[PDB]
Paper text:
It also possesses the capacity to form heterodimers with the sole monothiol glutaredoxin (SmGrx2) present in this species. It shows a winged helix-turn-helix motif formed by four helices and a three-stranded β-sheet (α1β1β2η2α3α3′β3 in which η: 310-helix).
This first structure was named SmYrbA-Ni. All these residues belong to the [H/C]-loop, but both Asp and Leu residues are not or poorly conserved in YrbA/BolA proteins.
Numbering used by the authors: 4 to 77
Write the structure that this text describes.
Amino acid sequence: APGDIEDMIKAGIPGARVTIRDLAGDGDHYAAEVVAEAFRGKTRVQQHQMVYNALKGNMGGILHALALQTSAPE
Ligand SMILES: [Li+]
Ligand code: NI
């Protein structure tokens, strides 16, 4: 449902700030920016792993369907 991706990320990575856009308005492929203190000192691969973990396998095709940008807070 709408908002579920954001909800799952925030539940799984407490303190994260999330900005989700639905590419093409298609309800299928998305792009997300996730900013979290837990990301500081982690590589982008490690940060992305945390986001995949938070989705708990609920989003089929997540490798391509959730394009990610992650960072620690500024
Ligand atoms: Li989309
Ligand atoms: Ni797809």
